[PDB]
Amino acid sequence: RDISTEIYQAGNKPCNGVAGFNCYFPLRSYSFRPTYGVGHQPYRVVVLS
Amino acid sequence: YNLAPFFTFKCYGVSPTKLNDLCFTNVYADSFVIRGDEVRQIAPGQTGN
Amino acid sequence: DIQMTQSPSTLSASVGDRVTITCRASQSISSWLAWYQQKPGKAPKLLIYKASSLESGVPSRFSGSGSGTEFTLTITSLQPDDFATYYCQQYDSFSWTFGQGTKLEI
Amino acid sequence: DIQMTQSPSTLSASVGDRVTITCRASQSISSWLAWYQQKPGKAPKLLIYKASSLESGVPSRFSGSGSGTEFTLTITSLQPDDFATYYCQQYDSFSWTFGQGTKLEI
Amino acid sequence: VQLVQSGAEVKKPGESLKISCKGSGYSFTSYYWIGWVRQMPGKGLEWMGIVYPDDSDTRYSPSFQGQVTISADKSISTAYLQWSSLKASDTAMYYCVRHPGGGDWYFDLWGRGTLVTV
Amino acid sequence: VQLVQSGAEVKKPGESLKISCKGSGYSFTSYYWIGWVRQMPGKGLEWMGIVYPDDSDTRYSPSFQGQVTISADKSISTAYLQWSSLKASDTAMYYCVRHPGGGDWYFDLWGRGTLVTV
Numbered sequence: 001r002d003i004s005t006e007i008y009q010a011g012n013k014p015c016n017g018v019a020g021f022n023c024y025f026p027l028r029s030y031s032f033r034p035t036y037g038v039g040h041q042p043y044r045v046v047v048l049s
Numbered sequence: 050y051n052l053a054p055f056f057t058f059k060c061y062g063v064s065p066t067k068l069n070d071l072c073f074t075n076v077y078a079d080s081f082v083i084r085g086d087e088v089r090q091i092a093p094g095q096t097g098n
Numbered sequence: 099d100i101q102m103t104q105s106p107s108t109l110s111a112s113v114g115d116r117v118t119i120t121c122r123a124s125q126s127i128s129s130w131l132a133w134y135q136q137k138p139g140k141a142p143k144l145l146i147y148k149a150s151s152l153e154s155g156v157p158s159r160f161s162g163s164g165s166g167t168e169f170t171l172t173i174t175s176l177q178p179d180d181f182a183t184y185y186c187q188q189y190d191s192f193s194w195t196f197g198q199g200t201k202l203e204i
Numbered sequence: 205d206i207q208m209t210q211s212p213s214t215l216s217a218s219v220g221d222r223v224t225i226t227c228r229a230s231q232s233i234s235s236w237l238a239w240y241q242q243k244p245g246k247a248p249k250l251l252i253y254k255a256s257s258l259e260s261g262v263p264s265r266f267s268g269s270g271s272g273t274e275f276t277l278t279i280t281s282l283q284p285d286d287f288a289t290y291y292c293q294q295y296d297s298f299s300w301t302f303g304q305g306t307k308l309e310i
Numbered sequence: 311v312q313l314v315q316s317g318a319e320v321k322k323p324g325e326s327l328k329i330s331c332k333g334s335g336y337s338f339t340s341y342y343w344i345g346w347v348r349q350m351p352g353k354g355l356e357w358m359g360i361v362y363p364d365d366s367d368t369r370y371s372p373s374f375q376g377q378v379t380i381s382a383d384k385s386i387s388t389a390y391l392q393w394s395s396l397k398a399s400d401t402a403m404y405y406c407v408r409h410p411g412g413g414d415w416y417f418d419l420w421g422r423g424t425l426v427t428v
Numbered sequence: 429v430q431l432v433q434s435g436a437e438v439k440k441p442g443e444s445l446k447i448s449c450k451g452s453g454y455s456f457t458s459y460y461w462i463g464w465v466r467q468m469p470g471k472g473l474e475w476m477g478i479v480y481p482d483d484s485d486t487r488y489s490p491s492f493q494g495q496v497t498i499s500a501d502k503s504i505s506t507a508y509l510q511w512s513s514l515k516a517s518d519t520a521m522y523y524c525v526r527h528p529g530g531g532d533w534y535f536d537l538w539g540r541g542t543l544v545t546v
Contacts, residue, residue: 010066021050021058022066034459034482034529099372132416134355141405141420142355153418185355189415193371196355205490238534247523247538248473259536291473295533299489302473337501384503 061093100125100188104197111176112204119171119200121186126166130190133162133171136199137182146171178204206230206294210303218310219282225306227292229273236296237275239268242305243288252277282308311335311419313344313406318425323396331406331421332388339387340364342408345417346380346391350402358404361389401428429453429537431462431524436543445511447542449524450504457505458482461527464498464509465535468520478527479507519546 004026009015011022019025032042058065083091090097101124111117121131133146144153146162149169157179161172173180181204186197207230217223227237237255240248250259252268255275265283270276279286287308293300315331331346333339345360359370363382370378379392393400406421434448447464451457463478477488481500488496497510511518524539 021056024065032530034456130413130415134417136355141422143420144416144418147414147416147418187355187357187416192369194357194415196357198354236533240535242473247541248535249538250534250536253532253534253536293473293475293534298487300475300533302475304472338503340503 057088059092099193099195100127100191102186102188102195102197104184104186104200106200107198108201108203110203113176113178115176117173117176117202119184119186119202121169121171121197122167123169123188125191127188127190129165130188131162131164131169132187132189133160134185134187134196135182136185140182142185176202205299206233206297206301208292208294208301208303210290210292210306212306213304214307214309216309217282219284221282223279223282223308225277225290225292227270227275227277227303229275229294232272233294233296235271236294237268237270238293238295239266239277240291240293241288242291243285246288248289248291313408313419313421315404315406315421315424318427320425320427321396323398323400323428325396326392326394327396327426328390328392329404329424329426330388330390332386333406333408333419334387336408340382340384341411343411344382344389345407345409346378346389347405347407347417347420348374348402349405349423353402355405358391360409363387363389396428398428400426402426431526431537431539433522433524433539433542436521436541438545439514441514441516441546443514445509445514445518445544447509447522447524447544449507449509449539451507451526451537452505458502459529461529462500462507463525463527463535464496464507465523465525466492466520467523471520473523476509476522481505481507514546516546518544520544 007015007017007023008026009023015023030042063071087097089095102121104121109117129149131149132144134142135145136142145156145160146152149164150162152158152160159174162169164170169186171184181202184200184202188195209228211226211228215223235255238250239252241251242248251262251266252258255268255270258266265280267278268276275292277290287310289305289307291305292303312335313331313333316329319327321327333344340363343360343362346358348356348358357371358374358378359368359380361368361380361382363384366382368380370380380389381392382389389406391404403423404426405423407417408419409415409417430453431449431451439445449462451462458481461478461480464476466474466476475489476492476496477486477498479486479498479500481502484500486498499508499510501508507524509522521541521543523541525535526537527533528536
C-alpha cells in the first residue's frame with residue numbers, strides 16, 4: 001500500500017510543490033457521478049487473499 | 050514542455066510523461082483560438098457555447 | 099389467431115330473467131377469457147376476468163364459468179343496466195381477438 | 205445500532221451567552237455527526253455536517269467540534285431564533301440514530 | 311383513474327392523421343401497456359395494437375400490421391396512433407385502452423372513443 | 429430545491445395510510461436517496477427508511493423494518509410512506525428528507541411535515 005502524497009518530480013529539476021510543467025500531485029480524485037456510464041460508475045472491490 | 054510559461058497540458062486516456070514511450074496509429078492536431086474562460090469547455094463531455 | 103364465436107347473436111328476455119351467453123374458442127385458451135359489456139354509444143366495461151373473477155364495481159349477479167373451448171356468462175336477474183352488447187375476449191395468446199357479440203335486449 | 209446520548213437534556217442560558225452541547229457515541233465514529241436546528245412546530249434545518257463544516261445559510265456563530273465518541277456544538281452569542289431544539293445524528297454506519305434533543309431556553 | 315382521448319376528427323380519404331390518448335389518475339403510466347382497439351360502426355370490437363411507453367415497444371395485430379403506426383411518449387404519458395393515407399374503410403370508433411402486465415392481458419380501462427370519419 | 433409532503437390527515441386504527449412527498453427544484457431527482465423520519469409528539473427524531481428512486485432499492489431501520497413500506501415513483505419524482513394496521517403508537521409527525529450522494533448521509537433537505545394522529 002502506497003500512501004505517498006509527495007509531488008512527483010518528473011523533471012530532473014526539483015518539483016517541491018511547484019505544480020508547474022513536469023510537476024504535479026500524484027493522487028487524482030475519481031469524481032464519481034451517477035450520470036457517468038457503467039464503466040465510469042464506482043465499483044467496490046474486495047480481494048480475498 | 051518549453052511552450053509558454055503556464056501552459057495547460059491535459060491528457061485524457063494517457064499521461065503527460067508517457068507520450069514519449071508510446072506509438073500512435075493516427076494523430077491529428079486541431080488548432081484554434083478561444084477565450085480563456087472557454088478553455089475548460091474543450092474537454093470530453095462539457096457544456097458551453 | 100384464436101377465433102372466438104359468441105352465441106347467440108341476439109337474445110331477447112324480460113327484466114328479472116336468467117340468461118346464459120356462450121363463447122367458444124377455436125383453440126383451447128385455458129381460463130384466459132374476459133367478458134365485456136358495451137352499452138350503445140358507450141365504451142365497453144370489463145365485467146369478467148380469468149373467466150370467473152368479476153371486475154370490481156360490477157354487479158355480483160354476473161357470473162362466469164367454463165374452461166378450454168366452452169365458456170358461459172350467466173346473469174341470474176336482468177335489469178335495464180344489463181341490457182347491452184356482450185363480448186368475449188381471449189388473452190391466452192397474442193393477436194387478441196374479440197367475439198362477434200350478443201345483443202341482449204328487453 | 206450506534207447509540208447517541210445528548211447532554212444536557214435541557215439547558216437554560218441568557219441571551220448572548222456561549223452554549224455547549226455534548227453528543228456522545230456508543231462506538232467511535234470518524235467525524236460523521238450532523239447537527240440540526242428544530243424550532244417548535246418546524247422542520248429541522250441542517251447546521252453542521254462532518255461536525256466541522258456548516259451548511260449554507262447558517263451564520264458563523266454556530267460551530268461544531270469533536271471526534272470519536274465525543275462531539276460538541278457551541279454557540280458563541282445567542283439570538284432569539286437560536287433558542288430551540290438541537291439534534292445530533294451519526295451517519296458513519298447505517299441504521300442512523302438521532303440524539304434525544306436539547307431544548308434551549310433564555 | 312381514466313384515459314382522456316382527443317376529439318372526433320373528420321378528414322377526406324388520402325390524408326394523414328394522428329389520434330392522441332393520455333392516461334391520467336394512475337401512477338407509473340409508462341409501465342402500463344396502452345393499446346388501440348377499433349370498433350366499426352355497428353360491428354364487433356377489433357384490437358388494433360399495443361405499445362409500451364417506457365421503451366416504445368409495439369405489438370401490432372396481424373390484420374393491422376404494416377398499416378397503423380402506434381407510438382408513445384412517456385414524458386406526457388400520451389400514446390399516439392398515426393394513420394397515413396386514410397382509406398375509405400377507415401371510418402370507425404377508436405378506443406384507447408390500458409391493460410395490466412403479467413398474465414392479466416385484459417383491457418381493464420377503456421377510453422371514451424374518437425369518431426374518426428372518412 | 430424543496431420537498432412538498434402530503435397534507436396532515438387523521439385516520440382511525442386499522443386503515444391503510446399513504447403519505448406522498450414530491451421533490452422539486454433540483455434536477456436528477458431519481459438519483460437522490462429519499463427517506464422518511466418519524467417524530468413522536470414530545471420525542472426525538474427516529475430515522476425510518478430510505479429509497480433510491482431510480483432502482484427502487486429500499487433500506488430500513490431495524491425497528492421500522494416490515495412495519496413500514498417505503499416506495500419511490502421515479503416517474504413523478506415522488507416517494508410514498510405506506511403504513512398498514514394503523515395503531516395508537518402510529519401517531520407522530522413525519523418528515524420527508526433528502527440524502528446527498530457519496531459518503532454524506534445527513535439529511536440536507538427536510539419537508540414541511542405530515543402529522544398523522546390515530
